[PDB]
Amino acid sequence: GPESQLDLRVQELIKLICNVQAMEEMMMEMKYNTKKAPLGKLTVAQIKAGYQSLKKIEDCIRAGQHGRALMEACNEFYTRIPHDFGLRTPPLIRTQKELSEKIQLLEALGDIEIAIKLVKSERQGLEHPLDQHYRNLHCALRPLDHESYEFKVISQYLQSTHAPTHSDYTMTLLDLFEVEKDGEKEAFREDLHNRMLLWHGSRMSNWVGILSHGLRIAPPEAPITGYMFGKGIYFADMSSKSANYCFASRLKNTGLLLLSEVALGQCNELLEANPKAEGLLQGKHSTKGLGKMAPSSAHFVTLNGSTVPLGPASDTGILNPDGYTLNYNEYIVYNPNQVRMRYLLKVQFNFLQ
Ligand SMILES: CNCc1ccc(-c2[nH]c3cc(F)cc4c3c2CCNC4=O)cc1
């Protein structure tokens, strides 16, 4: 047929992120019943109806209801968002934690609905299908040389900010791409101080949606208690805190990890979870969940106007007297115009045992 005009490394990335069969397998792993509700029949309306049912579940949880009312709320959720629990009676979502853990399923379904729409796109024999998928992302992806300065600095950031408690794996950088998503530069809050190059990880199934639509905030219908610091976009300064969100496995041990310039401006610093954090900003530009360990000023470098908080991380002196303390920082912005995606890392996860 027509030959691909793409760099082979980009060809490889497209193949990885547009593989729908991998998306089915991953959703099967999350217990979504792809036989009852095939992924090619996912709609936005189904997913929003999903979020609405989770809101009804949140209502029950807030009321302390563990009986028929919660049974029916969960039944409604599981009808709209079919699960496979074997020969068990479907388990109730009884606590805020269980509820919060279910949001990721709806988020993956959202990004898969996007991915399937894109791969099923009309298509013209004029261009190789990889090239057609790439074009449809409206996101430039430029592979960098392993000998480049970029590759050296990012490799150093990846390694030096692998957190000591994320000891289950190491990471190897296999490939690196500069990212330029159409529209992101033009929207970006260049005016804001505290511009940092921060990590964001996600499941393999999500990247067509992320690269084509940008990082997005939860919809209005979603239950607020599902988000530790509210409906924003979350980032780490420690590579492995974000890489944990790739949910790589021993069998699927290749993931993608994103670095983005994040216009934090003035952070509202919090020790503890507060799903209503956004209403606390009062003029501030972002939320910072304070961790016990973080990169220090001493080791920082800049790349294209952004601070790269290279490690090693050291103790921040932070300790919550009145409860739980985050091990590592988290940063949350509540507008996509505080984000510019810059690098996409292809990372191999080297698991223990
Ligand atoms: C569990 N309720 C929904 C939810 C799911 C995931 C996250 C979350 N928190 C993070 C902190 C952080 F430093 C980095 C990341 C995240 C995420 C998911 C997005 N990816 C991150 O790397 C936030 C809320």
Curated annotation (Swiss-Prot):
Residues 3-120 form the PARP alpha-helical domain. The keyword Metal-binding does not apply. Residues 128-353 form the PARP catalytic domain. The modification Phosphoserine is found at residue 4. Changing residue 58 to A/R: Increased DNA-induced ADP-ribosyltransferase activity. It is an enzyme of class 2 (transferase). The active site is at 330 (for poly [adp-ribose] polymerase activity). Widely expressed, mainly in actively dividing tissues. The highest levels are in the brain, heart, pancreas, skeletal muscle and testis; also detected in kidney, liver, lung, placenta, ovary and spleen; levels are low in leukocytes, colon, small intestine, prostate and thymus. ADP-ribosyltransferase activity is regulated via an allosteric activation mechanism. In absence of activation signal, PARP2 is autoinhibited by the PARP alpha-helical domain (also named HD region), which prevents effective NAD(+)-binding. Activity is highly stimulated by signals, which unfold the PARP alpha-helical domain, relieving autoinhibition. Poly-ADP-ribosyltransferase activity is tightly regulated and PARP2 is removed from damaged chromatin following initial poly-ADP-ribosylation of chromatin to avoid prolonged residence (trapping) that has cytotoxic consequences. The keyword DNA repair applies. It is found in: Nucleus; Chromosome. It catalyses: NAD(+) + (ADP-D-ribosyl)n-acceptor = nicotinamide + (ADP-D-ribosyl)n+1-acceptor + H(+); L-seryl-[protein] + NAD(+) = O-(ADP-D-ribosyl)-L-seryl-[protein] + nicotinamide + H(+); L-aspartyl-[protein] + NAD(+) = 4-O-(ADP-D-ribosyl)-L-aspartyl-[protein] + nicotinamide; L-glutamyl-[protein] + NAD(+) = 5-O-(ADP-D-ribosyl)-L-glutamyl-[protein] + nicotinamide. GO terms for cellular component: cytosol; nucleolus; nucleoplasm; nucleus; site of DNA damage. Keywords: Acetylation, ADP-ribosylation, Allosteric enzyme, Chromosome, DNA damage, DNA repair, DNA-binding, Glycosyltransferase, NAD, Nucleotidyltransferase, Nucleus, Phosphoprotein, Transferase. NAD(+) binds at residues 200-202, 209, 216, 242. Auto poly-ADP-ribosylated on serine residues, leading to dissociation of the PARP2-HPF1 complex from chromatin. Poly-ADP-ribosylated by PARP1. Acetylation reduces DNA binding and enzymatic activity. It comes from the Eukaryota. Its EC number is 2.4.2.30, 2.4.2.-. One of its GO terms (molecular function) is chromatin binding. Its main location: nucleus. Poly-ADP-ribosyltransferase that mediates poly-ADP-ribosylation of proteins and plays a key role in DNA repair. Mediates glutamate, aspartate or serine ADP-ribosylation of proteins: the ADP-D-ribosyl group of NAD(+) is transferred to the acceptor carboxyl group of target residues and further ADP-ribosyl groups are transferred to the 2'-position of the terminal adenosine moiety, building up a polymer with an average chain length of 20-30 units. Serine ADP-ribosylation of proteins constitutes the primary form of ADP-ribosylation of proteins in response to DNA damage. Belongs to the ARTD/PARP family. The N-terminal region (NTR) recognizes and binds poly-ADP-ribose chains produced by PARP1, leading to its recruitment to DNA damage sites. This is Poly [ADP-ribose] polymerase 2. It comes from Homo sapiens. The chain holds residues 230 to 581 of 583 of the full protein.
